[PDB]
Amino acid sequence: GGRRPGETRTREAILTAARVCFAERGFDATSLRRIAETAGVDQSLVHHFYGTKENLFLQALELPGKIEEAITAAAQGGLDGIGERVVRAHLSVWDDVSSRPALMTMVRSALRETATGILARALGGVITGEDAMLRTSMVATQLVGLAMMRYVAHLEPLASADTDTVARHYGRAVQAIVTD
Amino acid sequence: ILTAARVCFYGTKENLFLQALELPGKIEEAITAAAQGGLDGIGERVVRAHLSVWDDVSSRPALMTMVRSAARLRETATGILARALGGVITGEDAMLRTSMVATQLVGLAMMRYVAHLEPLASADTDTVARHYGRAVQAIVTD
To answer: What angle do CA A162, A166, A167 make, to 5 degrees?
Structure first.
């Protein structure tokens, strides 16, 4: 949560309940009031800590927070092997999250505008040269497209291939925009 | 029939859907052409052909409304793409690599034509083909 006494516990309680509620009914069928009630607080509290329902949803989902952190760390180091590190980092996050029925239930209902803005910022400074920003949105597109087919649509044999084989091959695709 | 379908939106309500949708037969038509000839330049050819279908479709407000009114079409599209391309990606893990080219083409069109991701949505044909074509080429030759 953060700074204030009681604040982490209150935020945690609000996030736990939002996962339960959003996984039960989806984003539109879920109100901040029901989340507030499940959490033992009230709407006004939830608006204070989270702003909007949509900000709440993205926090409870964890993925956005996780993608940002994993891509940011992989985007450090040398341009050599960067494509593949970045793909590994992104698969590991989704492998983490797809372990989790409740998060996975929220994903399958659902995030993709969010994720592309997140990936553009995380890959900042990686892509330089001509059409740097076009090329950065193209890496973002690739990663989002990979995540949707491997973990949501379940396209075969992409869905059942080993993480290691997927990163080695899809890495090249990303490396090629980077070295472009 | 197709006209009204389009305004509203043999077979079933899903085949009357794909037919009036135009997009499936167009993508099949164009990626099949794009995939003939040399491995040099095929990534870019295929991107070019993909973007041309989608420039035609997206210029049709009724068609484009049908599209913006998603998964079953994405599944239809990946199938078409995997069959048009699955006899040109050849070595190690050719099935995985074909499903990655399909994934990349559907992502491209999802972001360029349905979601309006900038700068992708507004970029030039040649620019998009050139750069994204490399990404496809790396899958094909690797």
So the answer is: 120
The pair of three-digit structure tokens given for residue A52, joined into one six-digit string: 């909007």
Asked how this structure was determined, the answer is X-ray
Question: Residue A5's domain is classified under what CATH number?
Answer: 1.10.10.60
Angstroms from A118 CA to nearest CA on chain B: 13
**Are residue A90 and residue A176 in the same domain, yes or no?**
yes
As to burial, measured by CB atoms within 10 angstroms (0-12 exposed, 13-18 middle, 19+ buried), residue B118 is: middle
How close does chain A come to B1, measured CA to CA in Å? 31
Reported resolution in A?
2.3
Interface of B with A (CB under 8 A): 71, 74-75, 78, 93, 95-97, 99-100, 102-104, 106-108, 110-111, 115, 117-120, 123, 127-128, 131-132, 134-139, 142
Q: Do A10 and A74 reside in the same domain of the chain? A: no
Tokens at residue A128, please? 């330089």
Interchain pair B120, A112: CB under 8 A: no
- Look up the domain containing B106 and give its range: 1-142
